[PDB]
Amino acid sequence: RVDYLRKERAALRIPLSAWVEKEAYRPGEVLAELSEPYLFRAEESGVVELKDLAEGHLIYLRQEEEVVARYFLPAGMTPLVVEGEIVEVGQPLAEGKGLLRLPRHMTAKEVEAEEEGDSVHLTLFLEWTEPKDYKVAPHMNVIVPEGAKVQAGEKIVAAIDPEEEVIAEAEGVVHLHEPASILVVKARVYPFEDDVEVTTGDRVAPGDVL
């Protein structure tokens, strides 16, 4: 199981009168408090990809293959459009009703925003977790430990086949689940940070440097 940290820059328009002004929102934080309901309108046109995210929503808008917009609709703002709609500049994308919070797992960082008459345009650098499970067939050698910070482009699991190969899709903590066997050693474990002094199989006594 790899708990990839997914990252996305998306936008949201909301009325000043309702926006809670911050430079960052933590999974649950009160983004905006709307009195009267708000119809969030599409600021560009294209074919709509709906991204279902725990409790929040991410709209992607594609003209041809070039994504033209990325729209973020928080909690308490539910979609109006569906996978494959064609949307025109000003079509109500979602209806925001009451209080508007970040999802259970979504952090908003570095929210840059423009102030505009009565409306606010926020562009939010978003972060959340999307755990993917992976197959490991006998002739696949794990090359990473459990609980490992791993980078975009890192061979996690190796194989004699390039198609079978596993690469870490992005920044993600790697976990080890369901071991074909557990192995219990009467040993004593001594973690280290830089260079080791002692070779494997060696004889070692109380006080012997490791």
Q: What would the two tokens of residue 53 be?
A: 């995210």
Contacts 24+ apart (CB under 8 A), 74-79: 74/12, 74/31, 74/32, 74/100, 74/101, 74/102, 74/103, 75/100, 75/101, 75/102, 75/103, 76/100, 76/101, 77/38, 77/40, 79/50
Amino acid letter, residue 165: E
| 38 exposure class (CB count in 10 Å sphere: 0-12, 13-18, 19+) | buried
Tokens 């490791």 -> residue: 210
28: left (phi over 0), alpha (psi -120 to 50) or beta: left
Please indicate the experimental technique that yielded this structure.
X-ray
Strands 119-132 vs 107-116: parallel, antiparallel or unpaired: antiparallel
> Measured between alpha carbons, how far is 180 from 200 in angstroms, rounded to an integer?
25
Task: Tell me the residue ranges of DSSP E strands in the chain.
Answer: 2-15, 30-33, 38-41, 46-53, 56-63, 66-73, 75-79, 86-87, 92-101, 107-116, 119-132, 141-142, 148-150, 154-155, 157-158, 167-168, 172-174
Q: What is the resolution of this structure in A?
A: 3.2
Q: Is 137 exposed, middle or buried (0-12, 13-18, 19+ CB in 10 A)?
A: exposed
CA angle at 143 for the pair 138 and 149, rounded to the nearest 5°? 130
- Give the up-direction half-sphere exposure of residue 54: CA atoms within 13 A in the CB hemisphere: 16
φ, ψ for residue 138 (rounded to 5)?
A: -20, -60
